[PDB]
Amino acid sequence: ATIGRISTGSKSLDKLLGGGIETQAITEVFGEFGSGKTQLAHTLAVMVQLPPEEGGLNGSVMWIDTENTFRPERIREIAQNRGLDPDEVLKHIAYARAFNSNHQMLLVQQAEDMIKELLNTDRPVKLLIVDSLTSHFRSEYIGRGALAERQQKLAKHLADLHRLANLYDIAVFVTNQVILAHSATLRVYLRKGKGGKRIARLIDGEAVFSITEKGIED
């Protein structure tokens, strides 16, 4: 199947990405606390629901939250300010809190059931968010011997996410608060800049955007 692209809300960031975030791929954003990773996730969860000529995929969303940072009212605000019904947009986000890394891994396997259910509806799942991908792994696997064990478990988790992305034509979007190896398709470094701006760079030009009542924008 042909790749789809989801606008981030920022023309600058969209250009950096080659046209938006891709289905059949895992895009990882990483950066320090406060760099805007979760705001970008909230914005994408709205943008994907737009029709294709407006930068979306007529898609639904699955969101796995490891830090209790999902904010339904932020979704509703972004949606309303972009002309979408806030309650319809929120209804199309399936939401789950992951309690630990083993639960997080099960939830990805569990997500396949809803993906299959919605696959031939008018709003199939097109975006799967894991925010944060790494927080539970970092807290649980620590000390001598943990590097190999943590990386091996993360590799399996990412393999599961790659399979869902590739098999069901979904964009997987993951966040990472930051010499270790990484298995995401594309890695985007986010940081704070001057004037409240955020700056994004591809890892392995730079886009600049603001966090606004519309989520993110130029």
Ligand X SMILES: c1ccc2[nH]ncc2c1
Which residue number places its CB atom closest to ligand X? 96
Q: How far apart are CA 136 and CA 33, in angstroms?
A: 16
Shortest separation between residue 65's beta carbon and ligand X, angstroms: 8
Which residues bind to ligand X, rule: CB under 6 A? Answer: 62-64, 94-96, 107, 110-111, 114
Nearer to ligand X, 69 or 81 (CB): 69
H-state helical runs in the chain: 11-16, 37-47, 72-81, 86-91, 101-118, 135-140, 146-168
Q: What is the DSSP string of 108-123?
A: HHHHHHHHHHHTTSSS
Nearer to ligand X, 16 or 105 (CB): 105
Nearer to ligand X, 45 or 79 (CB): 45
Burial bucket for residue 112 (CB in 10 Å: 0-12, 13-18, 19+): middle
Shortest separation between residue 72's beta carbon and ligand X, angstroms: 14
Nearer to ligand X, 62 or 188 (CB): 62
Q: How far apart are CA 154 and CA 53, in angstroms?
A: 36
Shortest separation between residue 177's beta carbon and ligand X, angstroms: 20
Token digits of residue 217: 């924008």
Nearer to ligand X, 95 or 189 (CB): 95
Shortest separation between residue 94's beta carbon and ligand X, angstroms: 4
Shortest separation between residue 111's beta carbon and ligand X, angstroms: 4
Q: How far apart are CA 80 and CA 100, in angstroms?
A: 33
Q: What angle do CA 59, 98, 216 make, to 5 degrees?
A: 45
